[PDB]
């Protein structure tokens, strides 16, 4: 069903993740980390605090598609085991050295011709597929864009909903 899902979707915030790579988002999902510029870092921190949930939609750079979302479940830590993110030309490993913590709500994917019905008021109406890294995608817009995505047998959202 779909019902702890909108529960976890409450009043939430939405941020469009746009990864340069496929190996990143794998690791995403394999360790329940993310790592993004300090811009965006500083924003997400501000989000956590804000809202009860707030989700990270994912989507690989040229792949056409989201390839999930994650509820952030911590703010961003610095000192651990450094990631092994393969590095965009020009991003350094100190520039994703903050680290936050993520439980995946849905690893699997959705073509962008799926949301081709989903504006953006954030972005100016523009369909929600577009935007930059880091970029907000109001209430309503999110909500529906994390609800087309197909079911997730995988996971259970108690835990995540013990988190709030
Ligand atoms: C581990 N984090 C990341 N991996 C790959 N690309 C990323 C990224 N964060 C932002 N980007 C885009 C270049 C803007």
């Given at each position: ?23 990143n ?14 811009v ?35 703010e ?18 100190k520039?994703?050295?903050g ?11 959705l ?54």
């Open positions: 069903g779909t019902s702890k899902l909108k529960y976890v979707l409450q009043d939430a915030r939405f941020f469009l993740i746009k990864s340069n790579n496929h190996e988002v794998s690791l995403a999902k394999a360790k329940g980390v993310w790592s993004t510029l300090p965006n870092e500083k924003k997400l921190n501000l989000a956590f605090r804000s809202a009860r949930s707030v989700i990270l939609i994912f989507s690989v750079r040229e792949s056409g598609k989201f390839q999930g979302f994650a509820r952030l479940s911590s961003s830590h610095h000192g651990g085991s450094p990631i092994h993110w393969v590095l965009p030309a020009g991003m350094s490993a520039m994703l050295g680290v936050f913590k993520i439980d995946w709500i849905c690893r699997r994917e073509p962008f011709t799926k949301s081709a019905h989903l504006t953006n008021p954030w972005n100016e109406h523009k369909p929600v597929k577009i935007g930059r890294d880091g970029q907000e995608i109001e209430l309503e817009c999110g909500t529906q864009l994390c609800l087309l995505f197909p079911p997730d047998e995988s996971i259970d959202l108690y835990q995540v909903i013990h988190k709030m």
